[PDB]
């Protein structure tokens, strides 16, 4: 985090990368198995 | 005869100076296409750079030509 917003801040503008910047896909993290009460629910 | 040859190699030394000129220039020019590259989004910035930038370059040409012409014709 801390190299990244270095170079963030000297970045060149306009065009920067696409990364960066594009000009939805959900990703949803889950168990392989239950007896989680809530946790995959909620 | 005599005199006409210091006038005569009077032009050429001109024509010489010139050298430096179409030099200079071509800088100013250079960075122009290598900045469209980087900000396409700004040729607007560019575009108007491109006149001021260009007149400066070409103004102590002209003069050139000018010391030239008196040289060969007075």
Do not use: D, K
């Not at chain 1, 000297?10 to 000009?23: D, E, S, V």
């Not at chain 2, 100013?28 to 290598?34: D, E, F, M, S, T």
């Amino acid at each position: 985090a801390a190299v990244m917003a270095g170079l963030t801040a000297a970045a060149a503008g306009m065009a920067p990368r696409l990364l960066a910047g594009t000009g939805h896909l959900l990703v949803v993290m889950t168990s392989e198995r239950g007896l989680a009460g809530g946790f995959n629910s909620s | 005869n005599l005199g006409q040859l210091g006038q005569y190699l009077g032009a050429g030394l001109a024509c010489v100076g010139m050298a430096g000129a179409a030099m200079g220039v071509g800088n100013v020019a250079g960075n122009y296409l290598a900045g469209a590259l980087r900000n396409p989004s700004a040729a607007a910035s560019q575009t108007a750079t491109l006149f001021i930038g260009m007149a400066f370059a070409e103004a102590l040409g002209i003069f050139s030509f000018l010391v030239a012409l008196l040289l060969l014709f007075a």
